[PDB]
Structures are given as structure tokens and as C-alpha cells.
Write a protein that binds this DNA or RNA. Structure first.
Lengths: 271, 198, 42, 70, 64, 278, 51
RNA sequence: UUUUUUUUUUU
RNA sequence: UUUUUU
RNA sequence: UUUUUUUU
């Protein structure tokens, strides 16, 4: 069997011995959680309530509680996301190439096809915030159905419905096609949000920060403080571990009273 | 030196990560919580009722689509609700005095604290089906266990290069049930390596 | 040799019956629900 | 003993039990009684569901008696 | 998508969501050209039949 | 009001006395009478007229299938009413074609009725209709919560004097039984002994919560299901009736407008009837 | 079909439709109003009661 | 550390 | 036996 | 809101 440890029995926190130090005697000190970085997402109350009427007015929030339960609904993220959207789609915006080259660029920037949820950016049937007005992309529409439909639609939907604003702007998309258009007044508005860039800005709030030697030292304790991966695992039986806490309930208070008993009595008879 | 404006490059991989002296810096992180507990308790009762009323019209999959819940998550809501109600109607014991491990006790405290700060969720926010996306899930994701290699080296040429050797599936033994009786359970051992089926 | 099944597996399926698709019939409400797959404008 | 176990699995014909089958005369009548009792018990529980009461007292000391199925 | 369609057909026939039953529609059929798709569709049918008709209600042996 | 709480102001009445929850009626047998149940079924059957009828299937009759018998003890079919509707005889609508057609229709309807419950079991409210009520239920309850919060100070201050009349009286008896007399005690300690700071704070907190716990409708241990059970069941009775008489009681002499409002006011009658304490 | 993209603020999540269930419309309405608040939502409070 | 399950990557 | 407290 | 924090 394996009993007591045969070795240095170095501490989990990684501190040295000696006088005027946290640790005095050599030991493991596995129970000492104070030295270990832990969050505080709860709340603490006061020791005395001066108010006459019993009320929970002593409850206070913790500093780490605000960041422990965030919400992706704050207003100051949409503005930043919109700006990054324009800078992320610049490769295809200034790509004065054919449809084959433009399509490939958009595919890498946003994976989308059959059986996948795409953002709809770049598709002919989508509204985009273009710098200047431009006509829709009516190149993909059939020519046989539009020509036969232009006569049956009538004057109501041939010169006042869509053609009244189909050539108001000088610029156009995919060349020009005055013959082929959409007589019906179907507005292709609305869009969809991205799943890659949106998830990055949302998580940005979790990494924000608010005779001396030239070069600052790097104590070992620092490493183990935050990181929990490099820390030795527990080996003692759970039963013993749990019993240690119970022992301290009545032991600890006695030590505090024993110290002040001598100091207080000395002053009452000599001082 | 090179142009590649995308979000799956070597430098862009694992965005918002400490690379340098900031690794040792302490940082607070959000506390995870299961979806089946963040939903409004009120809605849980409603969902359970439907399930128990008409399983045919209200199937496990159809019920979760309206409220945006996964097939696995919705199953736990009915199971956890059932037991809570059973002990109350029968006058056996109160939920608060119920015996349970310490792992669940801490979870209950987080659930109450989650709503006290933000509030309960009226409707779940999760996708029913998965989607193939580039994400970092552990250290076993960015590794090839078949060829046992990290760096792929290939010849640079415009002409068609010969393809690589495809892997074969691993044949393992399995078991099936043929006859089941209250006093006996018969099973069959399948051996895919046997040439003769018979 | 240990990649594909032999001739024994193929022969067994012929006898077991594994080598108009579906019909959901409800007496009183719905006549029949046939899922036959074929050409429409053939 | 090996034959009996294999018989239930359907691999081989079921072997006869001890003393044969023709002598099994009293067991046939006894088995019918057990089967009849099971069917009769079913009829009893039918009525319960209509007025299921988790808590049922009695006219002795107002004692509580819980009911649970399995 | 397959499960949606199949599941929807059955309800129409029975007219569950109707205060006043008006039996007019008593014939629903599905036609698919693709062999692959056809096969898949069949599978869906099977699942639909389960949990609806009392003659095809399965139950695990341990709980049965 | 109770004699103990006789000092309650006008501004604090509705708090301790929760109103009777709008139109919350239940259908469970725990709060129903023989007379009421009979009346409700009668009111439904009165739509038509008949004298002669035939037995029903859902009544023993050499039961052989697990379809037409008592269902499993689910928390949707435990309340009393449909056991008194299924076994009901097949009523008529009121020579040669006048009788042959009437019989044929009834016989045909019989078979469909039988299988109505065989496949499906929920033919009441629609998906949106079910959800509609739910929305409103939450909304109405949210209001009460808001009120409480606003009136926090009022409630707490009120309860302070409540505990004074109980702690002082209760402590007086305890000292008399335990102690001997309070005549030789210091006057300064007389007030503290009768109203200690421990019991006063503990009783006030317990009494403060007493006033709370209103709106017991959305109660976890079977408090939500009660509304749903009583809501959905309404539609089921109507449907059942119609099934029996599909094409034998009306000659299609009304449009959709009349039919839509015909079943509107009908429900009103039922709710009043069942929801009554005479 | 793409050109110079101008940054524009949109709220695809809060977009009522003719196919959404009644419960979804209700749930989204309350959530939208909470994020638009500029007096309570965008504030930090230490104590729970207004002390 | 799973009520009605003898099933469950429970954590 | 006390203190705190959705 | 439960003999909750609280510990043979």
C-alpha cells in the first residue's frame, strides 16, 4: 500500500516557508481555498441591520456578478457590428470581375448553399444598403414569361407600377436590360444576420480590461493562481476532507479567544 | 505578404485568446447553465401537459419546434416535471427537502440567481438541428486520427495529382435481441468477420 | 477480402423477401394514402 | 439441461419435461385457475381510475393510507 | 422536410382542427420521380403510422 | 373581514383578499354536485329532439379491444363528465324513404363515431386558440406582481403593529407560567421582557409573508393544468354532439356568419351554469 | 449582385411575420422593449431595493 | 447520482 | 435560544 | 417562503 508521501510535500498554491510568510511549516494545505482564484457571482449581506422594520436592504451585488451573467441584447454592439460588416464585404464590393469570380469570393466569406442557412448577402433577391441608387438584378428572370406577361398586365402595371422608377437612376446592376423587368410590385426587402462575425463582437466584452528592480519578477504563485490545469490533484479520502471542515467549527473560535485572553488580561493588571 | 480576408485562417483561429503575457492574467468568464432550466417554469407545465394529453398530435419533435427546443432537451422537461408533481399530489415529501447530490444543489442556486438578475426566458433560443461550422471543440478536433499527422504535404502541380488511399471502416462485434421473456433473455452474437452467413 | 460481403449474404436476402411502396388506410375518415412514386406527365 | 435452454431459443425442438407430458394433468387445471385470477384482477382496477384518490382515509382513526401502482 | 409533409396529411383527413366537420377531402397521394427520394418517403410513412393507429403501437418488453 | 384583522385600512383590503380570478371555473369532480353535472349535459342535448334511441358501444358489451374502455389514468381524462357522455344512447333527429334514409345516416355515423376516439383523442381547441388563453393568463398575473412591489412599504409598515398585539399577549402567558410575578422587576426591563427584539423581528417577517401568496392559480403542484383542462373540454362536447347529427338536423340554411356566432353565445350559457354556487 | 455596402442598423430578430405563432409575437415584444430602454436597462445598481 | 425501466456516456 | 434573508 | 444561509 501507499501511505504518507515520500518527497518534498510542496504546497498547491506554490509559496515558500519561513518567518513573516503565509505558510510557516512544510505541508500541502489542500483545504486553503483563499489562495485560489475563484469568481463571485452571488451576493453578500450585512452583519447588522440598523433599520427598525425587517427588510432585505443589506443585499449587495458582487463585482464579478455583472460579467458572470451577461446578456446579448445591449445596444452598443449593433453599431459596431454594422461598421465591421462593410469592412468585411469589401473584397467583393470592389471586385470588378464576372459573376464567376464574384460568386467564389462571397462563398468563402459566408458558406451558403442548398440545405444551409445563408445570410442572403449578394443574392439577386435581397435589399442592400448601396451607396447610390441602382436598379434590381433582373438578369436571372426568364424572357419568355416576362414578354407574354407585359401585354396582359395592362397599362396599369407597365408604366406606373415598376417602370416608373426602373430607370430613374443612372447606375445599374449587371448591365442594362430595358426589355426584361418585373411588372409585379413585389418588394424584396429585409435581410438576414451573419453567424460568424456576429458571434465575435458579442464575446468581445468578456476580455475587456479597465530600490526597485528594472524587470518585474514572475513568482510561481502567479501561474497557479489563475490557471487550474497545472495544479496537483487531491488524493485524500473525501471523508477526511469533510471531517476537517467540521473540526474547525469549534476549534478555530477557541484559538481567537485564547490569544486575546492573555493580551487583555495583561493590560488589566499591569498597563 | 498574403491576402486572405476570412475568419478561418491560422491567426484568426480561436479568436479572443491570450497569446503572450496575458495568459496568466485572471479573467472572469460567464457561467454556463442548461437550456432546460433557463426556460420559464410556467411554460414547462404547459409543455408537459400537452405531451401527456395527446402524444400523437403533440409529438416529441413537433412540440419542440413551436417553442424552439431540441428533441433531447424537451425530453428532460417532461421527465423532471413528472417526478416533482408526483411527490406533491401523493403527499410524500416537499421538493425543497428532497435528497439529491451536491452537483444539483449548486445548479439550483445558479438557476434562481440567473432569473433574479436578468429573468426567466419566455422562449428558448436554440437550433433544432446542427450545422457544419468551423469551431474549436477540444484538442481532439484539429487532429487527424486516421493518418496520425498534423501537417499535410502535397506536390505542387497544375496537372491532376493521383488521389490518396481511402480508409476502410473498422469491423467490431455487436449484440442484438431476438427473444425476450420475463424469466429469460436470449441474445445473438454477431460476427461480421465470418465469411459464411448461414 | 474483408471489405465486402460474400455470395452467402446475397442469397439469404432472396429467400427472406428483402430483395406501390406504402399505404396508410383509415376506415371511416380517410380512404387511402398511397405514396406510389412515378412520373406525373409521362 | 443443454437441450432445454436451446429449445426456448428456437434452435432445436423443445424437449419434453420430467415425467413426460401426458402425466401433466393437475398442472393444466392449476394453470387455468391462475390465468382466471389475473383476468378477474384486471376488472377491479378499472373502476379505480375513474375516482383515483391519492389519499384515502378509513373509519378507524382517520389514518392516512397512500396508494401507488407498480 | 419529409416528416413535416407526412404528418400533415393525416391531420387533414381527420379534420382535427375543425369545430364543424365537413368531410370533402378523402384522397391524398404523393408522387416523386426520383428513386432515392421515393425510398426515403416510404420511411416517413412508417413513422407516421406509429403512435397513431392502435394496431401498430410498440412498447418495450421490460415495461410491457 | 376576520375579527383579528379589524384595523386594516381601505388601501390594503384587496391584498389580503385576493379576487376570485376573473373567469376561472374548473371541471374536476372535487368541487361539483350531482345537479350541476346533469344540467350541463342536458343543456347540450336540448338542441334537438328525440324520443327513441339505441344502446351505445362504449359500455361493456363483451369488451374485447383496449380502445372502447377505460383509458389509462392520465391527468386529462380524470374529471367526471365524458364517462356520462360516451355511453349515452344514439338519439334520433325527430315510412319508406322517410325511415330508410334516417336509419342509414344514423348507422353510418355510428361507425365514424366509434373510430373518432380510436385514433385521435384531442379534437378541441386549435394550436393558436390554446396559446391565446395562455398569453392572457400570464398578462393578468404579471399585473398583481407589479402592484405588490409598489406597495412594499405600505404592507411592511402595516404588519408591524399586527405582530405587536400577538407577541405581547403570547409572552405574557409564558412568563406567568414560568415566572412568579412581575411586580418586583425593574420598570426599565418590563417593556423589553414583554416585547423582545428577537420574537418581534421573527414574527413580523413571518406575518409579512402571510399577506403574500395571492393568485394561487399558477401553482406548480397542479395549478396550471386546471385552466387547460376546463378550456379544451368545452370544445370537445360541442364536437361530439355534431358528430351524432351531421346531415340529419340541418338543411344548410345558414351561411358562415350565422354558424360562427351560433357557437359563440352557446359557451356563455354553459360557463354560467357550471360556474355557480347557490 | 453587390456594391459598396453602407453600414446600416437592422433588427432581423424583432421582425413580426404572418407565420409566427401567437406566443412568439408576445415574447419578442417584451424582449424588444427591454433592450430599447435607456434609463433602467443601461444602468448599474448595487443594492436591490432603491436605498 | 433516473418514481412508475430490467434501457440511459446520469456528472 | 442568536444574526441574516424572494 | 421550504424547520433557507447552517455544518454528528
Amino acid at each position: 500500500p501507499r501511505g504518507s508521501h515520500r518527497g518534498g510535500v510542496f504546497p498547491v498554491s506554490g509559496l515558500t516557508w519561513g518567518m513573516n510568510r503565509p505558510y510557516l511549516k512544510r505541508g500541502l494545505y489542500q483545504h486553503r481555498r483563499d489562495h485560489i482564484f475563484t469568481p463571485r457571482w452571488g451576493t453578500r449581506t450585512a452583519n447588522f441591520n440598523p433599520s427598525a422594520l425587517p427588510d432585505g436592504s443589506t443585499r449587495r451585488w458582487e463585482n464579478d456578478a455583472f460579467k458572470a451573467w451577461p446578456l446579448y441584447g445591449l445596444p452598443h454592439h449593433v453599431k459596431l457590428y454594422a461598421v465591421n460588416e462593410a469592412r468585411y464585404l469589401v473584397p467583393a464590393a470592389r471586385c470588378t470581375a464576372g459573376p464567376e469570380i464574384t460568386q467564389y469570393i462571397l462563398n468563402q466569406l459566408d458558406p451558403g448553399g442548398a440545405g444551409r442557412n445563408c445570410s442572403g448577402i449578394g443574392r439577386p433577391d435581397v435589399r442592400l444598403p448601396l451607396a447610390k441608387p441602382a436598379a434590381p438584378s433582373t438578369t436571372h428572370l426568364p424572357r419568355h414569361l416576362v414578354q407574354i406577361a407585359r401585354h396582359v398586365m395592362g397599362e396599369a402595371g407597365e408604366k406606373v407600377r415598376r417602370k416608373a422608377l426602373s430607370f430613374a437612376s443612372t447606375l445599374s446592376d449587371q448591365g442594362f436590360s430595358p426589355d426584361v423587368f418585373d411588372p409585379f410590385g413585389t418588394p424584396l426587402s429585409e435581410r438576414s444576420r451573419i453567424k460568424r462575425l456576429y458571434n465575435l463582437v458579442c464575446e468581445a466584452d468578456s476580455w475587456r480590461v479597465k530600490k526597485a528592480a528594472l524587470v518585474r519578477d514572475l513568482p510561481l504563485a502567479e501561474i497557479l493562481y489563475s490557471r487550474h490545469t497545472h495544479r496537483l490533484q487531491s488524493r485524500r479520502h473525501p471523508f477526511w476532507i469533510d471531517m476537517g471542515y467540521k473540526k474547525r467549527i469549534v476549534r478555530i473560535p477557541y484559538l481567537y479567544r485564547r490569544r486575546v485572553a492573555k493580551e487583555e488580561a495583561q493590560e488589566r493588571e499591569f498597563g | 505578404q498574403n491576402r486572405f480576408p476570412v475568419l478561418n485562417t491560422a491567426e484568426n483561429f480561436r479568436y479572443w485568446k491570450d497569446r503572450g503575457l496575458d495568459r496568466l492574467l485572471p479573467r472572469v468568464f460567464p457561467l454556463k447553465l442548461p437550456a432546460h432550466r433557463r426556460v420559464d417554469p410556467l411554460l414547462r407545465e404547459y409543455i408537459f401537459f400537452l405531451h401527456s394529453m395527446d402524444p400523437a398530435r403533440f409529438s416529441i419533435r413537433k412540440l419542440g419546434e413551436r417553442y424552439g427546443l431540441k428533441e433531447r432537451t424537451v425530453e428532460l422537461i417532461c421527465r423532471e416535471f413528472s417526478v416533482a408533481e408526483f411527490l406533491r399530489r401523493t403527499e410524500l415529501a416537499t421538493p425543497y427537502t428532497r435528497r439529491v447530490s451536491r452537483e444539483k444543489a449548486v445548479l439550483r442556486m445558479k438557476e434562481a440567481l440567473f432569473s433574479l438578475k436578468l429573468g426567466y426566458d419566455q422562449l428558448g433560443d436554440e437550433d433544432l438541428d446542427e450545422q457544419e461550422e468551423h469551431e474549436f471543440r477540444g484538442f481532439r478536433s484539429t487532429q487527424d486520427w486516421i493518418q496520425r499527422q498534423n501537417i499535410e504535404v502535397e506536390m505542387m502541380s497544375a496537372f491532376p495529382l493521383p488521389a490518396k488511399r481511402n480508409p476502410l471502416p473498422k469491423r467490431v462485434d455487436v449484440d442484438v435481441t431476438v427473444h425476450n421473456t420475463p424469466k429469460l433473455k436470449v441474445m445473438n452474437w454477431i460476427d461480421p468477420n465470418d465469411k459464411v452467413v448461414f | 477480402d474483408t471489405a465486402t460481403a460474400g455470395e452467402a449474404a446475397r442469397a439469404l436476402e432472396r429467400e427472406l423477401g428483402l430483395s406501390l411502396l406504402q399505404q396508410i388506410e383509415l376506415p371511416g375518415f380517410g380512404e387511402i394514402n398511397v405514396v406510389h412514386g412515378d412520373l406525373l406527365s409521362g | 439441461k443443454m437441450g432445454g435452454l436451446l429449445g426456448n431459443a428456437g434452435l432445436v425442438p423443445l424437449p419434453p419435461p420430467m415425467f413426460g407430458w401426458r402425466t401433466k394433468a393437475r398442472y393444466t387445471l392449476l394453470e387455468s385457475v391462475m390465468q382466471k385470477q389475473e383476468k378477474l384482477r384486471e376488472n377491479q382496477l378499472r373502476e379505480y381510475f375513474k375516482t383515483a384518490e391519492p389519499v384515502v382515509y378509513r373509519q378507524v382513526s382517520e389514518d392516512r393510507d397512500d396508494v401507488e401502482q407498480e | 422536410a419529409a416528416e413535416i409533409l407526412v404528418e400533415s396529411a393525416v391531420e387533414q383527413l381527420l379534420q382535427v382542427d375543425a369545430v364543424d366537420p365537413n368531410y370533402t377531402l378523402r384522397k391524398i397521394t404523393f408522387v416523386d420521380r426520383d428513386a432515392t427520394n421515393a425510398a426515403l418517403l416510404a420511411e416517413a410513412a412508417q413513422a407516421a403510422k406509429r403512435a397513431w393507429l392502435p394496431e401498430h403501437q410498440v412498447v418495450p418488453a421490460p415495461v410491457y | 373581514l376576520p375579527p383579528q384583522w379589524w384595523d386594516c385600512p381601505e388601501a390594503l383590503v384587496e391584498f389580503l383578499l385576493p379576487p376570485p380570478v376573473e373567469n376561472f371555473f374548473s371541471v374536476d369532480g372535487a368541487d361539483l354536485d350531482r345537479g350541476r353535472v346533469e344540467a350541463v349535459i342536458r343543456r347540450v342535448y336540448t338542441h334537438s329532439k328525440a324520443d327513441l334511441a339505441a344502446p351505445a358501444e362504449p359500455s361493456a358489451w363483451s369488451s374485447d379491444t383496449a380502445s372502447a374502455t377505460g383509458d389509462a389514468p392520465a391527468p386529462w381524462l380524470q374529471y367526471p363528465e365524458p364517462n356520462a357522455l360516451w355511453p349515452n344512447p344514439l338519439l334520433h333527429n325527430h315510412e319508406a324513404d322517410a325511415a330508410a334514409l334516417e336509419a342509414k345516416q344514423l348507422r353510418m355515423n355510428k361507425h365514424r363515431l366509434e373510430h373518432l376516439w380510436k385514433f385521435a383523442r384531442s379534437y378541441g381547441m386549435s394550436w393558436d386558440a390554446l396559446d391565446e388563453v395562455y398569453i392572457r393568463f400570464v398578462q393578468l398575473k404579471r399585473s398583481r406582481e407589479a402592484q405588490w412591489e409598489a406597495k412594499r412599504g405600505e404592507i411592511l409598515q402595516y404588519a408591524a403593529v399586527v405582530a405587536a398585539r400577538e407577541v405581547r399577549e403570547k409572552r405574557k402567558k409564558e412568563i406567568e407560567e414560568a415566572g412568579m410575578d412581575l411586580a418586583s422587576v425593574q420598570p426599565e426591563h418590563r417593556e423589553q421582557m414583554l416585547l423582545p427584539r428577537s420574537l418581534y423581528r421573527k414574527q413580523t417577517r413571518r406575518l409579512f409573508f402571510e399577506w403574500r401568496r395571492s393568485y394561487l392559480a399558477p401553482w406548480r403542484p397542479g395549478g396550471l393544468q386546471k385552466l387547460m383542462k376546463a378550456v379544451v373540454t368545452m370544445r370537445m362536447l360541442q364536437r361530439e354532439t355534431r358528430e351524432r347529427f351531421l346531415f340529419l338536423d340541418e338543411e344548410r340554411s345558414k351561411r358562415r356568419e350565422e354558424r360562427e356566432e351560433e357557437q359563440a353565445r352557446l359557451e356563455e350559457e354553459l360557463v354560467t351554469l357550471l360556474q355557480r354556487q347557490a | 449582385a453587390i456594391d459598396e455596402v453602407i453600414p446600416e442598423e437592422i433588427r432581423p430578430e424583432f421582425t413580426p411575420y404572418t407565420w409566427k405563432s401567437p406566443l412568439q409575437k408576445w415574447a419578442e415584444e417584451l424582449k424588444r422593449k427591454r433592450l430599447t430602454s435607456h434609463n433602467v436597462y443601461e444602468t448599474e445598481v448595487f443594492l436591490h431595493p432603491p436605498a
